[PDB]
């Protein structure tokens, strides 16, 4: 079994705009989650080959990780903040679907999600 290529993070055909919400998602949300004590497994795609998980990419068809989110924000890949919020939600839901409730990785994802939800509640109004 092989890992798939990582998610796309740049498309120069996609229109680009800088908004206070997108700036907040990179400088505040992504930065805060990146620095969390439990963030390291979420900083790059699930390495199914290294971890010998041949079923991971049979179950998870929409993989997502924070390394991908960081690059999509830097590349102005998202036109609206909701597309970015969806990617974080996909990353958390993937972890919950693949792993058993109560497993260490799930507890780590739940701690990151609690922090994420706190920062999203503080999402600034569109300027």
Ligand X SMILES: Cc1noc(C)c1-c1cc(C(N)=O)c2c3ccc(C(C)(C)O)cc3n([C@H](c3ccccc3)C3CCOCC3)c2c1
Query: Is the CB of 11 or the CB of 40 nearer to ligand X?
Result: 40
Q: Give the span between the Cα atoms of 115 and 119, in whole angstroms.
A: 6
- For ligand X (CB under 6 A), the number of binding residues is 12
**By CB under 6 A, residue 83 contacts ligand X:** no
Query: Is the CB of 28 or the CB of 110 nearer to ligand X?
Result: 110
Long-range contacts of residues 93-102, Cβ cutoff 8 Å, at least 24 apart: 94/46, 94/60, 94/62, 94/63, 94/64, 95/42, 97/59, 97/60, 98/56, 98/59, 98/60
Q: Give the span between the Cα atoms of 24 and 27, in whole angstroms.
A: 5
Closest separation in Å from C-beta 83 to ligand X: 21
**By CB under 6 A, residue 59 contacts ligand X:** no
Closest separation in Å from C-beta 94 to ligand X: 6
List residues binding ligand X (CB under 6 A). 41-42, 44, 46-47, 51, 95, 98-99, 104-105, 108
């Amino acid at each position: 079994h092989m890992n798939p290529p990582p998610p796309e993070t740049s498309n120069p055909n996609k229109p680009k705009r800088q908004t206070n919400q997108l700036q907040y998602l990179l400088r505040v949300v992504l930065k805060t989650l990146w620095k969390h004590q439990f963030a390291w497994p979420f900083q790059q795609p699930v390495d199914a080959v290294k971890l010998n998980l041949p079923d991971y990419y049979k179950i998870i068809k929409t993989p997502m990780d924070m390394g991908t989110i960081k690059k999509r924000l830097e590349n102005n890949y998202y036109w609206n903040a909701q597309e970015c919020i969806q990617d974080f939600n996909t990353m958390f839901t993937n972890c919950y679907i693949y792993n058993k409730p109560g497993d260490d990785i799930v507890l780590m994802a739940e701690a990151l999600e609690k922090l994420f939800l706190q920062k999203i509640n503080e999402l600034p109004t569109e300027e």
